């Protein structure tokens, strides 16, 4: 399924970062959180939205992953200073690739050729992409983000924060599903080059991390998000200014640890003896035990315990 605070949520474990949210999928409910608004600068973490913006435009049929698009100098590392040290998927002007191995590229690669050579084919152009980009935050309620390029270089304005990157990444999990799975991929051969996804916790060996991407902001630390399944529950940790890469990638699997093992996401509301609503909450184990739930239409409420303690409340019908 997709959909204010959990009632006996057992203690946050300390968090060596900057920035903090762990988020559950399915209700986007905030398990813990430190200092989750502040505006820090997102590096190549923008390459989350500018996929967006391709995921949205296969969604409303603009375009089609099959599509043949064909690479400008715009999209050639030669030539381009703004390029140079930076993440390639190495497309030469006149290549002809498809929309889907441009995506390949940005996600596997993130490759900020294939940034361009999407945004020319989506937009028409860099800076109408970067409208697109800016919409898309908006409609999103993303309100400490702001875009200036279409993969994070030459952009000292750009911003945002743990949290609307939370945020963006579940619109991300929850939109085209074969989109989103590129995010797995664990390797891309493109023009003789092969390259490894920079995202390590995929190799983890004691979860099922399909994560989405680790970055860093020169002289504002390190950055990840990752996001792991177990069973028929998503969760989702976001981690900005981290001491060093090993502290992330530490700090990403303690927060995913303590959501996995200490709450659980459940459906309490369905069709029947109490509704009309389906309604899903996050909730520790602990407190599974304790949960009690005190003409077409009707009136009363039901009124949902947990202990001796109410925690909300929705009409009752029939």
Known sequence: HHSENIPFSPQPPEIHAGSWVLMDYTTGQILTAGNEHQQRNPASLTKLMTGYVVDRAIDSHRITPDDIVTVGRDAWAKDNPVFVGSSLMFLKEGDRVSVRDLSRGLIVDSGNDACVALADYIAGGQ???VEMMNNYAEKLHLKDTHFETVHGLDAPGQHSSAYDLAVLSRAIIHGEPEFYHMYSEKSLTW???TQQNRNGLLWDKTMNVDGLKTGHTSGAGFNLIASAVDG???L???????????????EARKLLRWGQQNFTTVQILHRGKKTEQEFWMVLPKAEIPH???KAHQRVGEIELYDRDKQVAHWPLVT
């Open 127 to 129: 800076r109408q992409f």
């Open 236 to 250: 989702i940790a976001v981690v900005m200014g981290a001491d060093s890469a090993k502290g992330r990638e530490e």
């Open 291 to 293: 949960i009690k739930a």
């Open 191 to 193: 023009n003789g080059i």
């Open 232 to 234: 028929q529950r998503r």
